[PDB]
Design an enzyme around this catalytic site. Structure first.
Site, PDB file in Angstrom:
ATOM      1  N   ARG A  23      -9.193  -8.268  -3.875  1.00  0.00           N
ATOM      2  CA  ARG A  23      -8.967  -9.559  -4.501  1.00  0.00           C
ATOM      3  C   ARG A  23      -9.179 -10.721  -3.547  1.00  0.00           C
ATOM      4  NH1 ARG A  23      -2.833  -8.212  -5.477  1.00  0.00           N
ATOM      5  NH2 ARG A  23      -2.843 -10.449  -5.986  1.00  0.00           N
ATOM      6  N   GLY A  24      -9.077 -10.481  -2.240  1.00  0.00           N
ATOM      7  CA  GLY A  24      -9.288 -11.507  -1.242  1.00  0.00           C
ATOM      8  C   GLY A  24     -10.166 -10.996  -0.113  1.00  0.00           C
ATOM      9  N   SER A  67      -7.942  -8.184   1.820  1.00  0.00           N
ATOM     10  CA  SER A  67      -7.407  -6.967   1.235  1.00  0.00           C
ATOM     11  C   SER A  67      -8.425  -5.852   1.436  1.00  0.00           C
ATOM     12  CB  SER A  67      -7.108  -7.158  -0.252  1.00  0.00           C
ATOM     13  OG  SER A  67      -8.304  -7.272  -1.002  1.00  0.00           O
ATOM     14  N   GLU A  68      -7.933  -4.623   1.590  1.00  0.00           N
ATOM     15  CA  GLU A  68      -8.809  -3.466   1.762  1.00  0.00           C
ATOM     16  C   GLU A  68      -8.479  -2.373   0.742  1.00  0.00           C
ATOM     17  OE1 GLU A  68      -8.687  -2.524   5.949  1.00  0.00           O
ATOM     18  OE2 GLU A  68     -10.701  -3.344   6.240  1.00  0.00           O
ATOM     19  N   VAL A  69      -8.808  -2.632  -0.519  1.00  0.00           N
ATOM     20  CA  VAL A  69      -8.630  -1.671  -1.597  1.00  0.00           C
ATOM     21  C   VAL A  69     -10.019  -1.268  -2.065  1.00  0.00           C
ATOM     22  CG1 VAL A  69      -7.547  -1.179  -3.806  1.00  0.00           C
ATOM     23  CG2 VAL A  69      -6.480  -2.789  -2.226  1.00  0.00           C
ATOM     24  N   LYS A  72      -6.392   2.642  -0.417  1.00  0.00           N
ATOM     25  CA  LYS A  72      -5.819   1.402   0.094  1.00  0.00           C
ATOM     26  C   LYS A  72      -5.674   1.535   1.603  1.00  0.00           C
ATOM     27  CE  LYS A  72      -1.356   0.250  -0.310  1.00  0.00           C
ATOM     28  NZ  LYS A  72      -0.115  -0.290  -0.935  1.00  0.00           N
ATOM     29  N   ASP A  74       8.382  -6.737  -5.711  1.00  0.00           N
ATOM     30  CA  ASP A  74       7.120  -7.471  -5.787  1.00  0.00           C
ATOM     31  C   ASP A  74       6.502  -7.305  -7.175  1.00  0.00           C
ATOM     32  OD1 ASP A  74       5.103  -9.144  -4.988  1.00  0.00           O
ATOM     33  OD2 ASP A  74       3.993  -7.626  -3.863  1.00  0.00           O
TER      34      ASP A  74
HETATM   35  N1  LIG Z   1      -0.675   0.626  -4.417  1.00  0.00           N
HETATM   36  C1  LIG Z   1      -1.123  -0.638  -3.857  1.00  0.00           C
HETATM   37  C2  LIG Z   1      -2.006  -1.395  -4.848  1.00  0.00           C
HETATM   38  C3  LIG Z   1      -3.430  -1.547  -4.318  1.00  0.00           C
HETATM   39  N2  LIG Z   1      -4.398  -1.913  -5.341  1.00  0.00           N
HETATM   40  C4  LIG Z   1      -5.011  -3.084  -5.394  1.00  0.00           C
HETATM   41  N3  LIG Z   1      -5.838  -3.117  -6.423  1.00  0.00           N
HETATM   42  C5  LIG Z   1      -5.762  -1.915  -7.058  1.00  0.00           C
HETATM   43  C6  LIG Z   1      -6.425  -1.405  -8.209  1.00  0.00           C
HETATM   44 BR1  LIG Z   1      -7.707  -2.525  -9.148  1.00  0.00          BR
HETATM   45  C7  LIG Z   1      -6.153  -0.112  -8.654  1.00  0.00           C
HETATM   46 BR2  LIG Z   1      -7.050   0.602 -10.223  1.00  0.00          BR
HETATM   47  C8  LIG Z   1      -5.228   0.682  -7.967  1.00  0.00           C
HETATM   48 BR3  LIG Z   1      -4.835   2.489  -8.573  1.00  0.00          BR
HETATM   49  C9  LIG Z   1      -4.580   0.183  -6.842  1.00  0.00           C
HETATM   50 BR4  LIG Z   1      -3.310   1.342  -5.939  1.00  0.00          BR
HETATM   51  C10 LIG Z   1      -4.850  -1.140  -6.379  1.00  0.00           C
END
Ligand SMILES: NCCCn1cnc2c(Br)c(Br)c(Br)c(Br)c21
Length: 331
Positions: free
Chosen positions: A46-47, A50-52, A67, A155
């Site tokens: 999203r930014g 962030s590392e997703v 993540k 959160d």
């Molecule tokens: N648990 C920390 C959250 C991290 N996070 C951020 N964007 C996310 C998305 Br989009 C999905 Br789908 C899933 Br599953 C997770 Br996990 C995500």
């Protein structure tokens, strides 16, 4: 004199009766896997920071979410992992699938089950009155479960609620701020996101409990039924309480401050002023009236209370008339 102590009215001692290893996460030993079992496909971030990532488990070709954790104290890594393992299998709790380290960079990462999520900024506009009741009830299942397990999420916000609308699948995610509740413990008030911070965090009252999550849920519900995201749109932590006080009124705010003998920051003296408690009808108009009902207003009013002790519990919320039709269809 000092603040008046507080205790959760539900699930007060659930952690005391657990074995020590359940909540003593500093002693938890992590078994790190190899991130070479997963291939990163696409950044879901999203930014910029962030590392997703969406990834594929190369062993069985199943889709997962990776993540990559930001460098925080090892205690907080163990805390999130332990909480995720403690809640595994719970209703609408995200499933932790694996824990890995990159072989080269030695960076720790968590592997989660994949959810085909639609971002709330696009999904919420399409939700019917029934969809909101349905998804609020699903969040309450996750909150009542994790509260009964002695854990505050801390959160709760739409960004941390994944929804597969096609399959009506909801998962509560991002447990990196979650903590174990212990009666009498004083917690850090620098948690949650500004627009979903409970008044106890804003006035620096540290002996809070699960009811913090119920205020945050109230902010979500208000944004959804009124079509105003976010509902309390403060510019900082001080202005966030001012935005709240212009809706709930200052009378209940100063009663809340006097009841717990909270020392109010002198900055709040000038900015808070005096405001009456507004009726929820003032926020209703032709674009959101189809989502607003007497049941929705009665339920929302019981979530957004200054006094954290007087907010509904997750269990009490699930029994509100607002969810009668959702409970009927589920049976
Ligand atoms: N648990 C920390 C959250 C991290 N996070 C951020 N964007 C996310 C998305 Br989009 C999905 Br789908 C899933 Br599953 C997770 Br996990 C995500």
């Amino acid at each position: 004199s000092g603040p008046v102590p507080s205790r959760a009215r539900v699930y007060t001692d659930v952690n005391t009766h657990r074995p020590r290893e359940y909540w003593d996460y500093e002693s938890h030993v992590v078994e790190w896997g190899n991130q070479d079992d997963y291939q990163l496909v696409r950044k879901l971030g999203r930014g910029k920071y962030s590392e997703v990532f969406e990834a594929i488990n190369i062993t069985n070709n199943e889709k997962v979410v990776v993540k990559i954790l930001k460098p925080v104290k090892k205690k907080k890594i163990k805390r999130e992992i332990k909480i995720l393992e403690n809640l595994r299998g719970g209703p609408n709790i995200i499933t932790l699938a694996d824990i890995v380290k990159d072989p080269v960079s030695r960076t720790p990462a968590l592997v989660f089950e994949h959810v085909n999520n639609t971002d709330f900024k696009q999904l919420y506009q399409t939700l019917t009155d029934y969809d909101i009741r349905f998804y609020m009830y699903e969040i309450l299942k996750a909150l009542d479960y994790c509260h009964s397990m002695g854990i505050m999420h801390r959160d709760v916000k739409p960004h941390n609620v994944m929804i597969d609308h096609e399959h009506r699948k909801l998962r509560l995610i991002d447990w990196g701020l979650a903590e174990f509740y212990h009666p009498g413990q004083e917690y850090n008030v620098r948690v949650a996101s500004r627009y979903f911070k409970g008044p106890e965090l804003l006035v620096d009252y540290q002996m809070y409990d699960y009811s913090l999550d119920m205020w945050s849920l109230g902010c979500m519900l208000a944004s959804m039924i009124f079509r105003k995201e976010p509902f309390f749109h403060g510019h900082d932590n001080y202005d966030q309480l001012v935005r709240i006080a212009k809706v709930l009124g200052t009378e209940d705010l100063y009663d809340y401050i006097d009841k717990y003998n909270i020392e109010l920051d002198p900055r709040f003296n000038d900015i808070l002023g005096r405001h009456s408690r507004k009726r929820w009808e003032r926020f209703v108009h032709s674009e959101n009236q189809h989502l607003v009902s007497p049941e929705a207003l009665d339920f929302l009013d019981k979530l957004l209370r200054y006094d954290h002790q007087s907010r509904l519990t997750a269990r009490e919320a699930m029994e509100h008339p607002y969810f009668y039709t959702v409970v009927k269809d589920q049976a």
